[PDB]
């Protein structure tokens, strides 16, 4: 073969084979992890079930995450101050102080905001003049009309603790930073020696249309229903029934062409409050066609099967049900059993004996 | 009832723009281009093959040196390739794992990534530390970001899930200008070769042309029946390509402010994913849900080529900066290049 190619190639192809070895090894987390989708309409129900299935963590104050949230708490402070100076600029008449050198000296650090590491004595020394200036708070109360980070006023009063070099913030400041509004609240744990990821939606858009196809090769999808919702008011239309919209969107999931092999797991997470409310508010509001009985323990199963029979033309979708639970260890044990059922089914399918 | 009076005046102004559109219409392009010369039969072979992935492929991007190619996974990887030598030069992980778009720098130093979690990330390659560092972050949008492009090495334009677009500067981490005016969610965008105008396409059958520095809705383009999923720009800076869910890709012109020509092959019901031009301005390269790509002539109004070398649905395609080659990425966990 060739020689002059090999000199530069002992960097090039060495890099390619090394990065190929670094890329192929992801099967340790690619195939060992089994993806679960979460969806429903009971938001507090969702939060309670996800906090119960999560193993109860405390990892906000570790010494390995230290510099990470340090960079976060630095970035938030500089973002907030440049945002409020942008707001002061967008105030149509200038409002500074008598000695206007504070607003001009701010431009030294607005141009000097091109660092990521440790905070300078210069930036602290100029923001201690900026927050001392009463104009920034005169516009900052008015900054609600504009885009504004809500955690602004906390650090800019407590800037002296920030100004100490080599200081470590606490769990409280971290938990003040790490609350996010919209996106994916992707949590994950490992139960019964199997790893599990858990994704969600927080009503990002009006209707789902595009991003559902991104979650294609998902082994399980978990729908949740707070079953004491028939009498609760859908306050976006004259149709009071909150149940029917959730049923319709559930029906749009079950007839989705991307989902013809993905099992569903159905939750009933508000039955205990239903068990007392059934007396005052029975089945006389939800449906006028249940002429069977009045009591809770059979009407619950009836509404379960009346939920279940919307599966259009499929005997390959294994709809699994549950009820509420106080100690959710058996609950997560049940969902463990369900997911291992569907994966052993998939395993014997791939083996070719069913 | 002043809202009804102003929407009456809105209706009559829509009547005025359609009056001006019918008035400035004299003769369509087809009868003027009845006497043009046909090209004939043009075949493309897959030159080199790229098979370094696991999950599906959502987006790719050519450089501005015809040397490097960028491509996004869906398993939390992001890989760049050399074009000629076909070696995996760099491949980075990221903290999220639901990405939907990339953009490479016109210089060749910055690479941008983003996706479902409403945050954009920019990375730096040319460092003294000998490894890629997580460099900069963009956050502020509500909905997921659709597509992003570089117009500079400092200023980045992007398109959100809240029916908006925005111009940011990477040193601040604050958006410079916000572009509101769309009604449906924006899906794709592209900018002019002169870096002065960009056009956004939503799911609401309308295309908005924006001047980058003014921040006013300069031009609107109605006519469609459904979502726009593909935008490409003409190399002169006068025309603009579209695409929709039933292969009804329509040509527009920004100077004359009017529809040019709709395209429709009689055996196609499938959707569009992304469209691309050539250096000539006589070629439209596009892909459909039946795995098929085909070159459509701009002036002749019809050709049904075949280069359907994908088992799964085609996802993204592009033309090179010099127009030498073209690149195709689909959900087969592969990446192919035609010439």
């Amino acid at each position, epitope marked *: 073969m060739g020689c002059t190619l090999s000199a530069e190639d002992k960097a090039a192809v060495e890099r390619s084979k090394m990065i190929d070895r670094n890329l192929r090894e992801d099967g340790e987390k690619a195939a060992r992890e089994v993806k679960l989708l979460l969806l429903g309409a009971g938001e507090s129900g969702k939060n309670t079930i996800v906090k119960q299935m999560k193993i109860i963590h405390e990892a906000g104050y570790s010494e390995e995450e230290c510099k990470q949230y340090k960079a976060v708490v630095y970035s938030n402070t500089i973002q907030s101050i440049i945002a409020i100076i942008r707001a002061m*600029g967008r105030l149509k008449i*200038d409002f500074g102080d008598s000695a206007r*050198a504070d607003d*001009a000296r701010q431009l030294f650090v607005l*141009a000097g905001a091109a660092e990521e590491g440790f905070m300078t004595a210069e930036l602290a020394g100029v923001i201690k003049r900026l927050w001392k200036d009463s104009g920034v708070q005169a516009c900052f109360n008015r900054s609600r009309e504009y885009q504004l980070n809500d955690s602004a006023a906390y650090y800019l009063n407590d800037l002296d603790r920030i100004a100490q070099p080599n200081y470590i913030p606490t769990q409280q400041d971290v938990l003040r930073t790490r609350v996010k509004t919209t996106g994916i609240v992707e949590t994950h744990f490992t139960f019964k020696d199997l790893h599990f990821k858990m994704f969600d939606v927080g009503a990002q858009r009006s209707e789902r249309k595009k991003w559902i196809h991104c979650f294609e090769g998902v082994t399980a999808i978990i729908f949740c229903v707070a079953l004491s919702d028939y009498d609760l008011v859908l306050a976006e239309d004259e149709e009071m029934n909150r149940m029917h919209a959730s049923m319709k969107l559930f029906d749009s999931i079950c007839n989705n062409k991307w989902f013809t092999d993905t099992s569903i797991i159905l939750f009933l997470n508000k039955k205990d409050l239903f068990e007392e409310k059934i007396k005052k508010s029975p089945l006389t509001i939800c449906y006028p066609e249940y002429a069977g009985s009045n009591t809770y323990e059979e009407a619950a199963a009836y509404i379960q099967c009346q939920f279940e029979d919307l599966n259009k033309r499929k005997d390959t979708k294994e709809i699994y049900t549950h009820f509420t639970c106080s100690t959710d260890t058996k609950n997560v044990q049940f969902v463990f059993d369900a997911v291992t059922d569907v994966i052993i089914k998939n395993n014997l399918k791939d083996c070719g004996l069913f | 009832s002043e809202l009804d009076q102003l929407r009456q005046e809105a209706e009559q102004l829509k009547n005025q723009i359609r009056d001006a559109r019918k008035a400035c219409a004299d003769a369509t392009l087809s009868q003027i281009t009845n006497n043009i010369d046909p090209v004939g039969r043009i075949q493309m072979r897959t030159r080199r093959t790229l098979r370094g992935h696991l999950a599906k492929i959502y987006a790719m991007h050519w450089g501005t040196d015809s040397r490097l190619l960028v491509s996004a996974s869906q398993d939390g990887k992001l890989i760049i390739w050399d074009s000629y030598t076909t070696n995996k030069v760099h491949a980075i992980p990221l903290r999220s794992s639901w990405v939907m778009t990339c953009a490479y720098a016109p210089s060749g130093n910055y690479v941008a990534c983003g996706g479902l979690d409403n945050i954009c990330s920019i990375y730096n390659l040319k460092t003294r530390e000998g490894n890629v560092r997580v460099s900069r972050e963009l956050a502020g949008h509500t909905g997921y970001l659709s597509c992003c492009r570089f117009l*500079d090495d*400092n200023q980045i334009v992007t398109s959100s899930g809240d029916t908006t677009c925005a111009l940011w*500067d990477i040193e601040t981490g604050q958006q*410079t200008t916000t572009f509101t005016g769309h009604t449906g969610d924006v899906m794709s965008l592209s900018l002019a070769p002169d870096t002065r105008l960009f056009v956004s396409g939503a799911c609401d059958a309308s295309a908005k042309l924006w001047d980058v*520095r003014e921040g006013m809705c300069r031009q609107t383009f109605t006519g469609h029946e459904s979502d726009i999923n593909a935008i490409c720009f003409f190399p002169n800076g006068n025309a603009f390509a579209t695409g929709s869910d039933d292969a009804t890709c329509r040509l527009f012109d920004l100077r004359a402010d009017q529809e040019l020509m709709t395209y429709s092959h009689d055996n196609i019901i499938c959707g569009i994913t992304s469209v691309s031009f050539s250096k000539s301005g006589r070629l439209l390269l596009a892909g459909y849900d039946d795995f098929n790509c085909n070159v459509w002539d701009a002036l002749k109004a019809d050709r049904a080529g075949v280069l359907a070398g994908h088992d799964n649905r085609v996802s993204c395609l592009g033309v090179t900066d010099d127009g030498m080659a073209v690149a195709t990425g689909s959900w087969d966990s592969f990446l192919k290049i035609w010439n």
Partner: antibody, heavy 126, light 104 residues
């Protein structure tokens, strides 16, 4: 949009003269005016930079303290006076625009550099 | 607060590279200028990245740590002048020594 200058010549070394630079076409208060000299056969050395925002200006690394700058808020014109002469004052002078704060004139992107220049005056000694 | 250029030359139909290294870890306020002999200094690039509107797009400005680079790709023979760098981070304004171009 252009500029203009005046006040070139020669006086015996030690005294001062009036050097004028007029900017035209835009706002005066929403920018800063820079002064720079150039020596025959040499490079470029900075002289002065007056901010209309605060007025807390400064001068060069060596020639500071002995010159005096001014710029009027109405006529939009800068005037410079230069005592304490030496052999290295034989030079062609220029003035230029620098938008420090980019937002007050219009909410815009940033810009770092001298934007618009003149043709420059010339002063010598003997 | 000083810097270091690289004095060099060029020829026609080439791509030329101009380097600049500042003394301290300076921020991203770097400008580039062109000067025809005995004439006005015209700006090329402001903020080390974006070119000025109107100048042809055969020039570009690169930043790498504390190093700055002017890149001219496939010049035209109407470019015979002297180029200059400029630091503008602080309120203390400076320049480079600068270099010129001359063919064989």
């Amino acid at each position: 949009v252009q500029l203009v200058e005046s006040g070139g010549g020669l006086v015996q070394p030690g005294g001062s003269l009036r050097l004028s630079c007029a900017a035209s076409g835009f706002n005066f208060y929403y920018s800063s005016i820079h002064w720079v000299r150039q020596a025959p056969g040499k490079g470029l050395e900075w002289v002065a930079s007056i901010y209309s925002y605060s007025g807390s200006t400064s001068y060069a690394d060596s020639v500071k303290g002995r010159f005096t700058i001014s710029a009027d808020t109405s006529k939009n014109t800068a005037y410079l006076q230069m005592n304490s002469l030496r052999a290295e004052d034989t030079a062609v002078y220029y003035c230029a625009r620098y938008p420090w704060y980019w937002w007050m004139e219009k909410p815009y992107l940033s810009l770092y550099g001298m934007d618009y220049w003149g043709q420059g005056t010339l002063v010598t000694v003997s | 607060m000083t810097q270091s250029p690289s004095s060099l030359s060029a020829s026609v139909g080439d791509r030329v590279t101009i380097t600049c290294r500042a003394s301290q870890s300076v921020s991203s306020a770097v400008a580039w200028y062109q000067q025809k002999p005995g004439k006005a200094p015209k700006l090329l690039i402001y903020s080390a990245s974006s070119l000025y509107s109107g100048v042809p797009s055969r020039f570009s400005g690169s930043r790498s740590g504390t190093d700055f680079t002017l890149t001219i790709s496939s010049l035209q023979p109407e470019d015979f002048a002297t180029y200059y760098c400029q630091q503008s981070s602080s309120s203390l304004i400076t320049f480079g020594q600068g270099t010129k171009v001359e063919i064989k």
